[PDB]
Design an enzyme around this catalytic site. Structure first.
Site, PDB file in Angstrom:
ATOM      1  N   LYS F 154      32.744  29.288  37.994  1.00  0.00           N
ATOM      2  CA  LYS F 154      32.205  30.547  37.636  1.00  0.00           C
ATOM      3  C   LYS F 154      33.197  31.280  36.895  1.00  0.00           C
ATOM      4  O   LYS F 154      33.020  31.816  35.823  1.00  0.00           O
ATOM      5  N   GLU F 180      38.603  44.943  42.651  1.00  0.00           N
ATOM      6  CA  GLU F 180      39.006  43.600  42.770  1.00  0.00           C
ATOM      7  C   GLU F 180      39.637  43.471  44.087  1.00  0.00           C
ATOM      8  O   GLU F 180      40.255  44.388  44.597  1.00  0.00           O
ATOM      9  N   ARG F 181      39.484  42.309  44.698  1.00  0.00           N
ATOM     10  CA  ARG F 181      40.076  42.068  45.958  1.00  0.00           C
ATOM     11  C   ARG F 181      41.396  41.679  45.463  1.00  0.00           C
ATOM     12  O   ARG F 181      41.461  40.775  44.653  1.00  0.00           O
TER      13      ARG F 181
END
Lengths: 167, 255, 480, 466, 127, 466
Positions: F154, F180-181
């Site tokens: 992905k 965002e992590r």
């Protein structure tokens, strides 16, 4: 802390929480009536319209709330240790709310050691005593002519509507 | 008052559902809250305090009672519905009346599965108890083979009879639109079915059987009934007569 | 200073300017902020003015001068918008600027009386087969165009319009139709494209495009339909026949709602407050087919809701349904089947449709509606199998690939073909093909007839026969 | 007395009259508002400020502007001169035949007549509809409430009802268009013109129109209900009459109330409602009924919000209903007309005896049959048919006829139907379904009962087929 | 403001001018106490989210620095706490003992014994 | 203007500016801010006190502070060094690889391109991935909504896209790792680095990174999106470029915003959805298009909130969609690299009208077959293919060939898989599947079609297979 004082009037909350402060604060030191008749003169030298909007301008901008009575009536000696609480009121925006502080204060300040009533079908029976219905019999000793059927009236009503009310 | 004056009073509060509506409304207008489902919470309390005042008192209070029949008319059977949950938690059952049945024409339209009296026996004559005890069961079981396998179509032959029995009883527990009774009469028809003399009859005619049957027992067995009425219980007299009556009379009802 | 017709912004930060002053103010005055933003003095509070701001507020710094305009909100009305894409203020945000309507009209201008109005009968067209046949209508008629995400939805309007091109480009003194395309919430490119299509269709000349792309400060967008409303009535009452496409009120409602809540004003159902009903009524009741005094007037309102999941269950839709004089549900699923157009016919309904379009058409269309119904119903025996055959043909026959509408005479004609099963002497694939050829055939030859059919407003036996004959040969030797 | 516009927040007009505060309900006329701007006092807020409601436009309302108390609550002309007139809420025409002038005016807020002159019981009116009469035998002078979705042929139906009834009527009729579409009123207008029973050689027509449309502000819509009531109570009681009071649609009233609730500063109850919603119901509804002083046959179009009935508003309504008329959108969707949900539509006088219990019983078998049949529908929904039971298979079919048999096209709305509609008197009805109960048709085409009146004709409809 | 300056612990002397009291900066008076929420008058340059110390020996944290007062989450009781109470800053926002020496140590959330293993190893504390 | 903190109640920092309250969204920098606590003006509350939203946290702060209104909003560097660099919202590295300082700084108050600036048609764009280009070929300036599974390649895919475009149109990209992590963004970094698409050899990598992690304030998480958006307008117009705006996830944004609306005490729309949800979106969204000097095509990672779509956010979103990318974990599962959820990735803007009628039609043919084919998959599923007619079997093969032909190895991971990718020019594509459709090659082996690019190359793979 402080100490609660109230000489009649007496509202509790919404200016009445406030009045009860200077009520113990003016009544301590007993500058109370000296500040009543102060605050009374100020009730109208304030309320005016040379200012409708120059001793009670709140805003057009803030500058008034910086000081305009922290500085225009601390421009007066009037209020000289109770003009601190008007400066609070000036900053804290409640400056249009004073009429009920002073009304509380003066219907406080007279009637501050006094008693007002109004029974049935009298209406100006509205005074400042320390005893009752010996005094309002003294208002029926104005003349008992003129009373307890006018101003406010036993005609339609007390008496007159009661026989209608049985039906 | 009545209670304390020995009087047994019956209040049908029809209904507190509406009451709440008002009560909250009132609260709200006082700005006094809209708790769960918009109702402030002590409406339970409201009623609790209200309803505890309905009791069966001891004799010092004349023994009286205030029997409380609170009513809640449900919107769509909405019962986990706050006030209903509430009410359920005070009440010692609920008598659910079931609409489908109504449409079926079954008025009273009950669902007695959802009608419960934890109370049960304190509330009844022996007479009825004797005939009814079994009946409840007979229907229960009847229902059950409609249910384990959610088909009215059967699972065992035995039950093809039992189902008949259930079905018969079904005709019987109905109640005429605009019609009450009294217990010995009630037992009269009930005995007839319970002890079965009319599964040898088609279920619709059971009620029909009653019209005649009843007018008969009223006529004749007001005697007998005199006894049952006396005993609050079906007695040996009554029974003996009954066994015979029901059979004979039934026989007469038919033939 | 005047704090009695002007005010200094007391607080703004919900973008609703509490303005101290403005006092002398009326009620309902359009104000101006010093930001060239307009506002509406929504609230005459005893003390300050809640002004709904027709702009945005990083565009404003506090204490801001709000000056009265001294005018209750008006919007341009007249006919200088016919050719314009405007913002609601009526500034052509096509970038044409002031080429807008001189007259302005109080946006407050309620629904004419009963008596002022006199019903529809005014054949209203789209050239869209289905409409003109199956949900035939007059002109006054609020009719909901409903279906999801430009699923041709938007496409539908284009064809609708397009048919009116000839009519407005004609002196159809009934179908000189002002299109008011209220474009609500629609991203600018989208509009641009669309607009472009319309430009191409250049119906713009008789057309207002009240133009709300996405972006846009909502109260304006919100105002925009009402703006449009004033204008459309402007045609209506000045005899003329107006078409408003409110596309869509969904977006208004949201905007409004958003507005509502922010105005700290209640919701209810779907979080909206109920004068979202009032919204639609006040707007839409103002739509009508007038009486004769108003030149029979019309503004035919084609509100659009581009559905979201067909949930009409949805109160706001329900609202609208009861207001509307029918709704046209377009079914995406069909679309997805390719079905162009993709209508959910069952829902597409004109309760009101009766005797206000085209008698000609009725003669085949009534029957068709019915035929299709039955055809649907059987969603075997021959009876039905015919219907099916026929039906499959008919499916095609209201099928109409996007970018094509018609004048009626043709429509009746091609349908006629199908209803004599001439199209049953085909099977679905050849139909279109047939149609094109046939069409050019009749166009040429039987232009006589087609013109004539257009004339006759009612199928005549003659027309039938000539047509039949035309058809029969055209058909027969050409079973494609 | 005069007030100052002190706050205008829309047509919720906050007025300070310092010239004393006349009743809550004292009707005010605004000064500086040439166009008669009624505000009705709602609250004595204190501060000599009342919250009042303008029902109308709030153009040019300078905050301070003088408002002059009308010195009573809202009063309207009432008099026979209203029939055939479209009166608005404000007692004024919208017949636009000049003013609807009457002898007497009435304050429109009023008492709910006392229990004892209220006739305690009533008699089923006949509507000429099988479905109705049979299944929900509504009562003359009752309040029949037409729950029904949006434009769900209800509007069609009511008109048809008018058609069926108002004609025949001995007393007169009122239509109160509450949140009615100007259009429908138009439609109606013409229909009425057409009908000529709004005869204009009559401002004493067979029907009076009072309209309080959607386009009005809620206060008006809110109020049209009271207005209409006031007139009609006058015709019923005062003009003796059996009034038919067509109200379409009280919901819109309700809504008008609710709509204000917020900005009545109130908590607008569930979903926004009114806490007082109920009292609102009492207060109109209890005013309308059948007394010994005539009958107000009260026809309430009730929009059933989102066809949500569990919806407290309708939830309440049923209570008020002598006749609850539930239109089944579900059925309606089947294209069916009569589209009713009659297992939801009731008449309390649907209860044996009253109506001739046979009549009823014939119904009871049906009601049942359909209901059981309804029961099956989950099973069927998947399962269709072939492991169920036969008797049911019969009922299914029979039901299917019955279903169809309730259906009847529109007599008026041949424009809508195409069809000619039908009308069925009792016998064919009672018999009709009863015949189906006899299953005399069970080899006769099932759908053929569709859109019929008399079962005979239906039998015929099966027949032409076979 | 309202009530909290019609509060005449404050007000009853503010009239007079008279005041001089708590810093109302670094100290506060308990304005209200109920629910372990001490609305504490003053405190206005208190560290935000500062754990404070009460005139009850408890800590609280001056979480909400509101314009007049501080909503102070009371890390405990409120019976004990009374109005006007001095809340004295500790200055300090939380640090907790930290180390890596709590291994074999059960604590209260503060990083201190509740084990009843006596006190823990954490010679460090760490914000 | 200067302010003092008058209240810190959380990150709504109520600051009273002691002088004028400049317009909303002024960035104020709090003095006594070691780290830029820009306060973004939220309300002019009055008082020249603002409701602000803290960009910073609240940590240990005294109040009454001295704040200097930065007199304008939040400024960030814009222009090319942002490529191959990660900045936080403040436009300050979090690449932690020193300063970006792209030459122009901006208030993220770059606004919508106005009506006149829009291309009045934007057209079809292509991606270099076959599957897309034939069936859902992009649009210049347009927003596509992206579904598909966490690093099904992905992440890679995205990287590849970035690769294709950045090149192919001379484009460049904005990546907003929206919420965002952070660890995963670190990780993320590493892939990009790894991939070299992030070039450390050029902060004129294909992508400018903006990472706006979970640990930042809601606002911060919300706002990084405009920041980025503003950037893409630079690159678009100003760099003339073809910007890609990767929004990752816009949903995580949605949430980030949403929190704010609520938290401002401001009523966000129902279920907490932003009041303004649509305008928030709108205001952002309208700033995306082909102006004339470029196009910012938005690549929107979209986590379908609650997998619910009428779910207002998506409900709105749809309005901003043109095309959708649904990636199929199933297709991925079929091994297929690409992993697309084919018929599910869309353009409804693909129209014969819009793209070639052929383009479309061919695509449509492919769609016919595939879709139908699926139908056959089911047939085949029912009792195994054996059950089919051979042409269909053939088409199955074609479909499958087409399947394999959708498969394209990955160029950026030509290294990692060892499956050396391609890029597919369109013509080859339309033709490609169409030719397969022309069925000649339906003889040819199928893994030929596997992982290739342009259709000729599949032919190459077929012989070579053979």
């Amino acid at each position: 802390f402080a100490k609660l004082v109230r000489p009649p009037v007496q509202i509790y909350g919404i200016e009445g929480r406030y009045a009860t402060a200077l009520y113990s604060a003016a009544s301590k030191q007993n500058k109370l009536e000296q500040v009543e008749k102060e605050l009374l003169r100020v009730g109208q030298i304030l309320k005016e319209p040379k200012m409708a909007a120059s001793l009670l301008n709140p805003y057009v901008k803030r500058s008034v709330k910086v000081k305009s009575l922290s500085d225009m009536t601390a421009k007066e000696k009037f209020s000289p240790l109770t003009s601190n609480l008007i400066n609070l009121l000036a900053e804290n925006g409640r400056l249009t709310n004073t009429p009920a502080v002073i009304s509380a204060f003066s219907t406080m300040m007279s009637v501050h050691r006094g008693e007002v009533p109004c029974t049935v079908t009298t209406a100006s029976a509205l005074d400042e005593t320390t005893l009752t219905e010996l005094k309002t019999v003294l208002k029926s000793f104005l003349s008992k002519g003129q009373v307890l059927k006018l101003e406010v009236k036993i005609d339609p009503s007390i008496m007159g509507g009661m026989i209608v009310r049985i039906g | 008052y009545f209670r304390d004056n020995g009087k047994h009073a019956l209040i049908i509060y029809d209904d507190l559902s509406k009451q709440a509506v008002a009560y909250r409304q009132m609260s709200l207008l006082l700005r006094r809250p809209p708790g769960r489902e918009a109702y402030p919470g002590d409406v339970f309390y409201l009623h609790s305090r209200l309803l505890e005042r309905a009791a069966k008192m001891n004799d010092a209070f004349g023994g009286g009672s205030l029997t409380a029949l609170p009513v809640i008319e449900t919107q769509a059977g909405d019962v986990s519905a706050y006030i209903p949950t509430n009410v359920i938690s005070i009440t010692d059952g609920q008598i659910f009346l079931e609409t489908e049945l109504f449409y079926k024409g079954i008025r009273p339209a009950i669902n007695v599965g959802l009608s419960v009296s934890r109370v049960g026996s304190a509330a009844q004559t022996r007479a009825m108890k004797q005939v009814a005890g079994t009946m409840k069961l007979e229907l229960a079981q009847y229902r059950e083979v409609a249910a384990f396998a959610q088909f009215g179509s059967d699972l065992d032959a035995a039950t093809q009879q039992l189902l008949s029995r259930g079905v018969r009883l079904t005709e019987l527990l109905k109640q005429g639109q605009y019609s009450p009774m009294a217990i010995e009469e009630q037992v009269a028809v009930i005995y007839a079915g319970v002890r079965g003399y009319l599964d040898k009859l088609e279920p619709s005619k059971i009620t029909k059987f009653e019209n005649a049957f009843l007018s008969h027992v009223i006529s004749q067995h007001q005697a007998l009934l005199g006894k049952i009425r006396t005993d609050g219980k079906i007695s040996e007299e009554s029974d003996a007569k009954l066994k015979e009556i029901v059979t004979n009379f039934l026989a007469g009802f038919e033939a | 200073v005047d704090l009695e017709e002007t005010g200094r912004v007391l607080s703004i930060g919900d973008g609703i300017a509490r303005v101290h002053g403005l006092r002398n103010v009326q009620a309902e005055e359009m104000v101006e902020f010093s930001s060239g933003l307009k506002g509406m003095s929504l609230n005459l509070e005893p003390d300050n003015v809640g002004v709904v701001v027709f702009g945005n507020d990083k565009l404003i710094k506090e204490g801001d001068i709000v000056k009265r305009t001294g005018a209750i909100v008006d919007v341009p009305v007249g006919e200088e918008l016919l050719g314009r894409v405007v913002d609601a203020l009526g500034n052509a945000i096509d970038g044409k600027g002031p080429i807008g309507s001189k007259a302005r009209r109080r946006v407050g201008l309620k629904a004419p009386g009963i008596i002022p109005r006199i019903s529809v009968r005014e054949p209203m067209q789209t050239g869209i087969k289905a409409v003109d046949s199956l949900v035939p209508i007059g002109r006054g008629q609020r009719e909901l165009i409903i279906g999801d995400r430009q699923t041709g939805k938007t496409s539908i309007a284009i064809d609708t319009i397009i048919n009116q091109k000839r009519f407005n480009d004609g002196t159809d003194e009934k179908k000189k139709l002002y299109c008011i395309y209220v474009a609500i919430g629609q991203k600018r490119s989208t509009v641009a494209q669309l607009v472009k299509r319309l430009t191409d269709a250049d119906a713009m000349k008789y057309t207002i495009v009240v133009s709300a792309t996405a972006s846009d400060a909502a109260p304006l967008q919100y105002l925009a339909p009402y703006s449009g409303c004033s204008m459309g009535e402007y045609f209506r009452d000045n005899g003329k026949h107006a078409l408003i496409i409110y596309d869509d009120l969904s977006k208004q409602a949201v905007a409004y709602r958003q507005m509502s809540l922010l105005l700290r004003r209640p919701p209810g159902r779907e979080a909206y407050p109920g004068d979202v009903f009032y919204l639609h009524s006040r707007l839409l009741e103002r739509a009508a087919k007038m009486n004769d005094a108003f030149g029979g007037g019309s503004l035919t309102a084609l509100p659009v809701i581009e559905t979201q999941a067909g949930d009409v269950s949805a109160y706001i839709p329900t609202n609208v349904i009861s207001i509307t004089d029918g709704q046209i549900f377009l079914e995406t699923e069909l679309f997805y089947k390719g079905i162009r157009p993709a209508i959910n016919v069952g829902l597409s309904v004109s309760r009101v449709g009766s005797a206000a379009q085209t008698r000609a058409m009725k003669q085949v269309a009534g029957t068709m509606k019915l035929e299709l119904a039955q055809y649907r119903e059987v969603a075997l025996d021959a009876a039905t199998q015919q219907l099916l055959s026929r039906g499959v043909r008919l499916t095609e026959l209201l099928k109409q690939g996007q970018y094509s509408p018609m004048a009626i005479e043709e429509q009746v004609a091609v349908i006629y073909a199908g209803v004599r099963g001439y199209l049953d002497k085909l099977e679905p694939s050849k139909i279109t093909k047939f149609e094109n050829a046939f069409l050019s055939h009749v166009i040429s030859q039987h232009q006589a007839l087609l013109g004539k059919i257009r004339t006759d407003g009612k199928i005549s036996e003659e027309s039938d026969a000539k047509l039949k004959e035309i058809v029969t040969n055209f058909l027969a030797g050409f079973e494609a | 007395t005069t007030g100052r516009i002190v706050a205008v927040i829309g047509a919720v007009v906050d007025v300070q009259f310092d010239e004393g505060l006349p009743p809550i309900l004292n009707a005010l006329e605004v000064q500086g508002r040439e166009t008669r701007l009624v505000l009705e006092v709602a609250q004595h807020l204190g501060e000599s400020t009342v919250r009042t409601i303008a029902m109308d436009g709030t153009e040019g309302l300078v905050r301070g502007q003088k408002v002059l108390d009308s010195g009573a609550p809202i009063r309207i002309p009432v008099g026979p001169e209203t029939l055939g007139r479209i009166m608005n809420v404000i007692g004024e025409p919208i017949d636009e035949r000049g003013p609807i002038k009457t002898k007497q005016f009435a304050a429109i807020h009023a008492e709910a007549p006392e229990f004892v002159e209220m006739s305690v019981e009533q008699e089923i009116l006949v509507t000429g509809i099988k479905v109705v009469d049979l299944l929900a035998p509504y009562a003359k002078g009752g309040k029949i409430g037409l729950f029904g979705g949006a434009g769900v042929g209800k509007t069609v139906l009511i008109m048809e009802l008018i058609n069926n009834v108002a004609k025949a009527h001995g007393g007169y009729s009122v239509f109160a268009g509450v949140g009615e579409r100007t259009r429908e009123g138009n439609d109606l207008y013409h229909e009425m013109i057409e009908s000529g029973v709004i005869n204009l050689k009559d401002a004493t027509s067979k029907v009076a129109l009072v309209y309080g449309q959607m386009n009005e502000p809620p206060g008006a819509r809110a109020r049209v209900a009271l207005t209409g009531l006031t007139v009609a109570e006058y015709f019923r009681d005062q003009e003796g009459q059996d009034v038919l009071l067509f109200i379409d649609n009280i919901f819109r009233f309700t809504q008008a109330g609710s709509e204000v609730s917020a900005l009545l500063g109130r908590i607008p109850s569930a979903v926004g409602y009114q806490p007082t919603l109920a009292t609102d119901m009492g207060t109109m509804q209890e005013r309308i009924t059948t007394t010994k002083k005539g009958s107000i046959t009260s026809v309430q179009a009730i929009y059933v919000p989102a066809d949500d009935l569990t919806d407290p508003a309708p939830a309440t309504t049923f209570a008020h209903l002598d006749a609850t008329t539930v239109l089944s959108r579900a059925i309606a969707e089947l294209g069916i007309y009569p589209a009713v949900d009659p297992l939801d539509s009731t008449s309390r006088i649907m209860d044996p005896n009253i109506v001739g219990s046979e009549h009823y019983d014939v119904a009871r078998g049906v009601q049942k049959i359909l209901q059981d049949y309804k029961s099956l529908q989950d099973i069927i929904a998947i399962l269709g048919m072939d492991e169920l039971s036969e008797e049911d298979k019969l009922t299914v079919s029979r039901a299917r006829k019955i279903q169809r048999f309730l259906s009847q096209p529109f007599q008026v709305a041949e424009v809508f139907t195409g069809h000619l509609g039908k009308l069925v008197p009792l016998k064919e009805t009672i018999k009709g379904f009863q015949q189906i109960l006899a299953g005399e048709y069970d080899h006769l085409p099932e759908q053929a009962f569709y859109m019929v009146g008399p079962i005979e004709e239906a039998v015929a409809k099966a027949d032409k087929l076979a | 403001k309202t009530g909290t300056a019609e509060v005449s612990s404050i007000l009853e002397e503010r009239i007079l001018g008279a005041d001089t009291s708590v810093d109302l900066e670094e100290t506060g008076r308990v304005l209200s106490i109920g629910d372990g929420i001490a609305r504490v008058h003053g405190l206005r340059n208190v560290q935000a989210e500062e754990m404070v110390e009460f005139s009850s020996g408890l800590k609280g944290m001056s979480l909400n620095l509101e314009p007049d007062n501080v909503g102070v989450v009371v890390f405990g009781n409120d019976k004990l706490i009374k109005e006007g109470d001095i809340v004295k800053r500790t200055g300090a926002i939380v640090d907790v003992p930290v180390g890596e020496e709590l291994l074999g140590r059960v604590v209260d959330a503060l990083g201190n014994a509740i084990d009843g293993k006596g006190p823990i190893g954490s010679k460090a504390r760490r914000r």
